[PDB]
């Protein structure tokens, strides 16, 4: 019975009188077109540009009357150009940077016609999308992103848009792997939006990223802290060595500064105070006192043999109030951002 | 027969005999081209290349005799795949570098024709413009920023723009976020342009663009002034300490040379001295002017009870001249570039 | 006379930018008031109200505030505070807004 011939001059038949231009019943209720996606991969996150890059499967599905066959037991497969010739829902996603269908070999587009005419037509999609983050907790921040799938041409009133099986229309996702960032959770979401031409139907896909704390404390914490740590061995030295304590506290200014540059290209040039900016002008204040300490001191040496045991008496203080006022900042930084 | 069939028969006897060679009513009167705009975002705003991207829904709104039809009460919304087959305004953007239609499932156009002939269409577009920027008060500064619309093909004999709706033609302002960035008024423009070829018509859209110091505030101006705070530190330590009066003071003097010559590398080259880099270069002539101070104290207490007294002298005075001096400078410069 | 509404707003309100306000009376359909973007300071409102209302923010108490300014009779409604998505459509029609006020009323 499945003659190729057959199969030709039944085809054919289908496309013989179909005309591109007007969608499945039209003047008739609204096409209900299914979506599925699966994801591939998430290349990149990156906040400098307030964007990610996301590959994916793409599916669609729909039933149109003019296409329905019989005769044939075969979910038919064609080839892709025939996407050329057909009908499809004109499903675009809003919130793109740039979008493109890879075009290795042959543009990666699949049609496959199932004989009551509902057809299924899908394609594989790299496309960079803006997600704008909420930086007020930088390197302790929970980001919401989320992919917009609309219709641009038809309105309510001609689609529908609605998830295949609900919860299990969107597949693959908790095998994805960022190496910044952990995929806490994500949802779905089917509803309707309205312009001035109309109500149009939208689907959206949203995930939720959680950052990992360890990239920070490598780079980060670790070498900012024990600066501020070393810029305390000014209060041992003794204080009648003034070429080596002032080159002491103002080599650890130099330090510091030195992060504050290597961290100025990660980051977008945001108005409000970061979390990372709060700790590193906290530091520097540190470090700044820290030396302004042997100024107070040595102006008190020599502004006078009791001073003797002033500059040991300031020396002593300072030995215990600055690494306990540094442990209270820092123990009040960690826990106000974790609780609060 | 049938509203199927029906539709089918009308678009064709529209389109059979259509000519897109020819303009509407050609050798007539001009056809009148409403439009309006709908914002989806600005990208980004970029010193370093003199442009911004521009990312939008485009609309137009013509009359066509041709395309009338009757006995269908409905505003037919044809497939996007006619816009290639019927005649559309050359309109195009003047001040263009760089700029695509979006084309991901399906490239992103829209036609909508109604029973008396009137077309609208559409598309959604990334445009990266030219954007001429005075950065003389940078980063106090405000842009203006544009979009020049114009047709190219066709005189002002032939072709009319008009915002469609006046004052409301434009849309979406609200929705456009930029770090950098807040708009402060956006304001419309119809005007008719000459050239050698004749004259044409012009639709201009325009953005008054207010920079947010709150970025420079903490990463610029701070560093620089705490840098000439810690400059002063020298008029408190002992003059006999020649080591660590000099250490400091070059250390100073050289982390100012630092930021005077690093940060321009985020800006473009420009032959005019801009208000942040009169700044810095004041601020430097702080810091350099307070090391020549201390020169001139070695000098005096070494060189030529004046050794003693003449030393002190000019010591003590330094303790409060300089910041004076300083808190004036600063005063004047941010009374100017906010004032006047 | 003139009244001062204000709208507080509490949670994640960074996922919904946009906020305004519409207003109901007996008989009719809700109208379009007014919006504002939190941290652009962009408006834009109807026509009815132009120049006569103004609204405001404080991005630190989490407040929007309008300035009800010149009323007239026909201002007479309840004015419902609500919140828009970031990628949802036009600012003029209420089924693009998810977040909910309780109605606060005015009497003139």
């Known amino acids: 019975p499945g003659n190729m011939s057959f199969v030709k001059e039944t085809v054919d038949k289908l496309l013989k009188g179909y005309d591109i231009r007007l969608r499945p019943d039209f003047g008739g209720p609204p096409v209900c077109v299914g979506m599925n996606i699966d994801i591939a991969s998430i290349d990149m996150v990156s906040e400098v540009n307030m964007d990610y890059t996301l590959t994916m499967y793409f599916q669609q599905y729909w039933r149109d009357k003019r296409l329905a066959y019989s005769g044939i037991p075969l979910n038919l497969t064609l080839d892709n150009r025939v996407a050329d010739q057909l009908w499809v829902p004109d499903t675009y996603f809003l919130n793109d940077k740039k979008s493109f269908v890879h075009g290795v070999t042959v543009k990666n587009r699949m049609i496959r016609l199932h004989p009551d005419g509902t057809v299924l037509y899908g394609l594989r999609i790299t496309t960079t999308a803006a997600c704008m983050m909420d930086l007020r907790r930088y390197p302790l921040d929970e980001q919401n992103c989320t992919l917009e799938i609309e219709s641009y041409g038809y309105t309510t009133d001609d689609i529908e848009f609605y998830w295949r099986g609900g919860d299990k229309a969107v597949t693959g996702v908790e095998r994805i792997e960022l190496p910044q960032f952990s995929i806490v959770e994500h949802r779905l979401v089917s509803r309707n939006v309205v312009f001035a031409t109309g109500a149009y139907p939208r689907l959206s896909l949203s995930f939720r990223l959680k950052r990992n704390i360890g990239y920070f404390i490598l780079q980060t914490y670790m070498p900012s802290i024990l600066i501020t740590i070393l810029s305390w061995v000014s209060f041992w030295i003794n204080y009648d060595a003034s070429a080596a304590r002032v080159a002491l506290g103002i080599t650890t200014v130099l330090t510091m500064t030195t992060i504050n540059t290597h961290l100025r290209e990660t980051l977008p040039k945001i108005p409000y105070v970061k979390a990372i900016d709060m700790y590193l002008m906290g530091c520097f204040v540190f470090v700044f006192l820290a030396l302004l300490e042997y100024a107070f001191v040595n102006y008190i040496f020599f502004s006078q043999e009791l001073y003797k045991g002033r500059a040991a008496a300031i020396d002593r203080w300072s030995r215990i109030v600055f690494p306990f006022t540094f442990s209270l900042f820092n123990l009040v930084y960690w826990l106000y951002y974790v609780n609060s | 027969p049938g509203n199927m069939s029906f539709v089918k028969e009308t678009v064709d006897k529209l389109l059979k005999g259509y000519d897109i060679r020819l303009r509407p009513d050609f050798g007539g009167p001009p056809v009148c081209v409403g439009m309006n705009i709908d914002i989806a975002s600005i990208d980004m705003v970029s010193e370093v290349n003199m442009d911004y991207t521009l990312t939008m829904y485009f609309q137009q709104y013509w009359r066509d005799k041709r395309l009338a039809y009757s006995g269908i009460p409905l505003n037919l919304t044809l497939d996007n795949r006619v816009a290639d087959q019927l005649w559309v305004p050359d309109t195009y953007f003047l001040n263009d570098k760089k700029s695509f239609v979006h084309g991901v499932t399906v490239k992103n156009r829209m036609i909508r024709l109604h029973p008396d002939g009137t077309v609208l269409y559409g598309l959604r577009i990334t445009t990266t413009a030219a954007c001429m920027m005075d950065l003389r008060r940078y980063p106090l500064d405000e842009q203006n920023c544009t979009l020049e619309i114009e047709s190219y093909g066709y005189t002002t004999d032939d072709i009319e723009f008009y915002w469609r709706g006046g004052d409301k033609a434009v849309t979406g302002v609200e929705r456009i976020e930029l770090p950098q960035f807040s708009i402060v008024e956006h304001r419309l423009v119809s005007r008719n342009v000459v050239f050698a070829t004749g004259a044409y018509p012009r639709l201009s859209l325009s953005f008054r663009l207010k920079r947010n110091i709150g970025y420079f505030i903490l990463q610029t101006y701070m560093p620089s002034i705490l840098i000439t705070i810690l400059s002063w530190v020298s008029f408190w330590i002992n003059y006999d300490a020649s080591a660590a009066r000099v250490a400091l003071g070059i250390t100073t003097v050289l982390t100012m040379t630092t930021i005077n010559t690093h940060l321009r590398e985020t800006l473009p080259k420009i032959p005019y001295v801009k208000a942040i880099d009169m700044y810095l270069m004041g601020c430097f002539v702080f810091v350099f002017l307070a090391l020549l101070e201390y020169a001139f104290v070695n000098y005096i207490f070494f060189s030529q009870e004046l050794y003693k007294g003449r030393a002190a002298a000019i010591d003590r005075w330094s303790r409060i001249v300089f910041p004076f001096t300083f808190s004036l400078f600063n005063l004047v410069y941010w009374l100017y570039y906010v004032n006047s | 006379g003139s009244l001062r509404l204000s709208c507080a707003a509490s949670g994640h309100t960074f996922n919904y930018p946009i906020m305004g306000w519409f207003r109901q009376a007996p008989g009719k359909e809700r109208e379009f008031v007014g919006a504002?973007?939190?941290?652009?300071?962009?408006?834009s409102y109807a026509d009815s109200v132009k120049d006569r209302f103004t609204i405001s923010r404080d991005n630190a108490k989490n407040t929007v505030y309008l300035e009800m300014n010149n009323l007239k009779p026909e201002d007479t409604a309840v004015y419902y505070c609500?919140?828009?998505?970031?990628?949802?459509?036009?600012?003029?029609?209420?089924?693009?807004?998810?977040?909910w006020g309780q109605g606060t009323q005015v009497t003139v």
């Open positions: 504002i973007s939190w941290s652009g300071g962009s408006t």
């Open positions: 609500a919140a828009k998505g970031r990628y949802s459509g036009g600012l003029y029609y209420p089924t693009n807004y998810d977040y």
